[PDB]
Amino acid sequence: HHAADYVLYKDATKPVEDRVADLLGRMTLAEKIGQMTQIERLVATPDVLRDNFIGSLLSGGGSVPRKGATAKEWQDMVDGFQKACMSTRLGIPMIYGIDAVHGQNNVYGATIFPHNVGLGATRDPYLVKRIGEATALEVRATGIQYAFAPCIAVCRDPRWGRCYESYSEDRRIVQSMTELIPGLQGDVPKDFTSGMPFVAGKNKVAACAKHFVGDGGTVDGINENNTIINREGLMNIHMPAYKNAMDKGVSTVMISYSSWNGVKMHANQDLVTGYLKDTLKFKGFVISDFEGIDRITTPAGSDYSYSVKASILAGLDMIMVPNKYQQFISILTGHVNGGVIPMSRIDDAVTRILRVKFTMGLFENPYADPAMAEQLGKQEHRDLAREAARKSLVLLKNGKTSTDAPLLPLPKKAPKILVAGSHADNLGYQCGGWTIEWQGDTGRTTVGTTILEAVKAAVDPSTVVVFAENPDAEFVKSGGFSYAIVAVGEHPYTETKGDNLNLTIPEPGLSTVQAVCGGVRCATVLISGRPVVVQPLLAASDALVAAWLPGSEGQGVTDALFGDFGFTGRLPRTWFKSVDQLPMNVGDAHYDPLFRLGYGLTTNAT
Ligand SMILES: OC[C@H]1O[C@@H](S[C@@H]2[C@@H](O)[C@H](O)O[C@H](CO)[C@H]2O)[C@H](O)[C@@H](O)[C@@H]1O
Ligand SMILES: *[C@@H]1O[C@H](CO)[C@@H](O)[C@H](O)[C@H]1NC(C)=O
Ligand SMILES: *[C@@H]1O[C@H](CO)[C@@H](O)[C@H](O)[C@H]1NC(C)=O
Numbered sequence: 306h307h308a309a310d311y312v313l314y315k316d317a318t319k320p321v322e323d324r325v326a327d328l329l330g331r332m333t334l335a336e337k338i339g340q341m342t343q344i345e346r347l348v349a350t351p352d353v354l355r356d357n358f359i360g361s362l363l364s365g366g367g368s369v370p371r372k373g374a375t376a377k378e379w380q381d382m383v384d385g386f387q388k389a390c391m392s393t394r395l396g397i398p399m400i401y402g403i404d405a406v407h408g409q410n411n412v413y414g415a416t417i418f419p420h421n422v423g424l425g426a427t428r429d430p431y432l433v434k435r436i437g438e439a440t441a442l443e444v445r446a447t448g449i450q451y452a453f454a455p456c457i458a459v460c461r462d463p464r465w466g467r468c469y470e471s472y473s474e475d476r477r478i479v480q481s482m483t484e485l486i487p488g489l490q491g492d493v494p495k496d497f498t499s500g501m502p503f504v505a506g507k508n509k510v511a512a513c514a515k516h517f518v519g520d521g522g523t524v525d526g527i528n529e530n531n532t533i534i535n536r537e538g539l540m541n542i543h544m545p546a547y548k549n550a551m552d553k554g555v556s557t558v559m560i561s562y563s564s565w566n567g568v569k570m571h572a573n574q575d576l577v578t579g580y581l582k583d584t585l586k587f588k589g590f591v592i593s594d595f596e597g598i599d600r601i602t603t604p605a606g607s608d609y610s611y612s613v614k615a616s617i618l619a620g621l622d623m624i625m626v627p628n629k630y631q632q633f634i635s636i637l638t639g640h641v642n643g644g645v646i647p648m649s650r651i652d653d654a655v656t657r658i659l660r661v662k663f664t665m666g667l668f669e670n671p672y673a674d675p676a677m678a679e680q681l682g683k684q685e686h687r688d689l690a691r692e693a694a695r696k697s698l699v700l701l702k703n704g705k706t707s708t709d710a711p712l713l714p715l716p717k718k719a720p721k722i723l724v725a726g727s728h729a730d731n732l733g734y735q736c737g738g739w740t741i742e743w744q745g746d747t748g749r750t751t752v753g754t755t756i757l758e759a760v761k762a763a764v765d766p767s768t769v770v771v772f773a774e775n776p777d778a779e780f781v782k783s784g785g786f787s788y789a790i791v792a793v794g795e796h797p798y799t800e801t802k803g804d805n806l807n808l809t810i811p812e813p814g815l816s817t818v819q820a821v822c823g824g825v826r827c828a829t830v831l832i833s834g835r836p837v838v839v840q841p842l843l844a845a846s847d848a849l850v851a852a853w854l855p856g857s858e859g860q861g862v863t864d865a866l867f868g869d870f871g872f873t874g875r876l877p878r879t880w881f882k883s884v885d886q887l888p889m890n891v892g893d894a895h896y897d898p899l900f901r902l903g904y905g906l907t908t909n910a911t
């Protein structure tokens with residue numbers, strides 16, 4: 306279709322499938338295996354990307370060009386990698402992935418949204434769609450085209466360190482929140498075939514339903530462990546939201562480190578090929594988790610030849626190596642050369658990877674748009690995060706007796722008020738894991754508003770606000786305070802570091818609540834990724850709010866505390882009486898919760 310040097314796959318007017326087949330037909334084995342290889346930016350250089358025909362890069366948690374990097378710095382980094390990839394013989398652009406799981410959270414100045422558990426509390430799928438829309442803009446602000454989200458785990462045991470990444474223990478809630486996908490990617494057209502990948506264009510990103518499948522069902526909530534459940538239970542609890550994701554055109558699916566009845570997901574042909582590809586008709590690409598294939602074996606990485614064979618034969622398309630690319634490429638090349646892995650399997654993997662790239666417009670817009678840089682941390686997106694934080698809050702108690710005056714909403718005008726606790730003025734703590742660093746961090750790690758700052762921004766000018774992180778009982782009794790807001794809870798964590806068999810918040814937390822509430826009426830704001838042992842906190846407190854991990858916009862908390870809006874959040878998980886009960890989920894035979902799934906007190910706006 307026209308000039309003498311015409312190349313069909315480079316023609317933007319041609320159908321995606323024709324472009325895919327045209328390109329695939331021209332590729333060497335090296336070029337094919339290259340597409341299947343995703344590497345960390347930490348090991349990438351122009352020569353590496355060119356010489357190995359690399360298909361993808363990622364930033365893992367905390368993998369950044371430098372701390373405090375601007376959006377333009379990120380764009381320049383990604384574009385530098387892309388220029389190298391576009392200089393190959395075939396000029397196949399790389400796709401760059403990142404964990405943008407509650408905003409573009411590795412990036413300084415990015416809006417940080419509430420984590421998924423709090424979003425489940427909102428029961429507001431359209432809110433979550435809007436969060437996806439805002440997240441896509443902030444990801445593209447940094448030049449990145451691919452977000453490793455949503456996590457559609459159905460966390461069945463809050464001892465899991467990733468429970469906060471699950472919208473709910475109830476698969477119906479998780480299904481509803483798959484609206485994140487068309488937020489990130491754009492809405493699919495009316496005609497759309499379930500299982501096809503979709504991204505609308507350069508202002509949207511590819512999404513990733515993860516981690517397939519049963520990541521939330523592991524024994525005792527042990528991260529990456531074994532999910533022991535029959536097929537009926539897997540299909541009833543852990544699988545449904547993957548079908549919703551297919552219906553919404555999710556572009557990629559990431560495989561879980563976990564096992565199902567002792568079979569590693571990264572080696573499970575029956576589920577990856579038989580079910581996801583052949584039954585759900587998924588036509589996007591399947592990606593490993595980080596060193597996921599290494600962890601097929603015990604010890605991890607002890608037979609990488611086997612890891613490569615098992616994973617590629619199981620049906621994975623792209624391997625998040627992410628560091629030992631030469632070994633990966635060498636081993637896979639050897640397996641193909643030896644007939645151990647057929648060319649049909651390689652061609653399928655590359656077909657899927659190319660399909661996603663062509664579909665999303667990556668060949669037409671391989672480089673960043675400098676005009677998008679200003680999307681990062683945009684006030685409109687912060688306003689959305691503030692709305693989400695407020696809606697996520699679950700009011701658990703509002704008065705010690707049925708006859709007391711309800712404490713909340715608090716008055717904005719009072720002579721003197723106390724703000725206290727380890728979590729009252731700690732932005733990193735209110736964001737939790739996957740914020741700037743992989744595991745999160747403490748203190749003023751990004752741009753945002755702490756609970757203390759939010760209180761100061763909310764109150765009447767005549768109201769004196771005193772901050773004391775851990776005041777003693779005498780300080781409070783002598784202080785002349787009208788009331789106190791005390792914020793405590795969990796420290797940031799991610800993945801296995803968050804696995805926790807006791808679910809008791811660190812001290813000082815309870816001691817501070819007891820000291821404060823003993824001296825003045827108190828509203829306790831509990832920051833956590835999950836239900837934690839709460840009876841002692843409740844006993845001390847006049848009012849108590851489960852605020853989850855609300856993100857950068859602390860004013861969402863004060864919007865409800867001071868009555869600008871009513872409390873509306875409802876528990877998206879069971880609140881247990883004790884950890885000895887676990888696992889214990891809504892619908893179980895011997896269900897004995899402290900607060901049932903769906904529980905939440907309300908207030909009316911002042
Ligand atoms: O970052 C890519 C994927 O990685 C793993 S987390 C990974 C971790 O396993 C590794 O030890 O450290 C990396 C960098 O700190 C993490 O990104 C997670 O399981 C996925 O959810 C995530 O999408
Ligand atoms: C589960 O965890 C135990 C204890 O660390 C470990 O020995 C076992 O191999 C794990 N099982 C799986 C399937 O990951
Ligand atoms: C609870 O477990 C966590 C994580 O395993 C640990 O850091 C903490 O010390 C434990 N707390 C108690 C009270 O045992």
Ligand SMILES: *[C@@H]1O[C@H](CO)[C@@H](O)[C@H](O)[C@H]1NC(C)=O
Binds near residue numbers: 908909
């Ligand atoms: C809140 O409004 C509802 C609905 O009108 C009402 O039933 C309830 O009594 C109100 N509570 C307060 C404290 O105003």
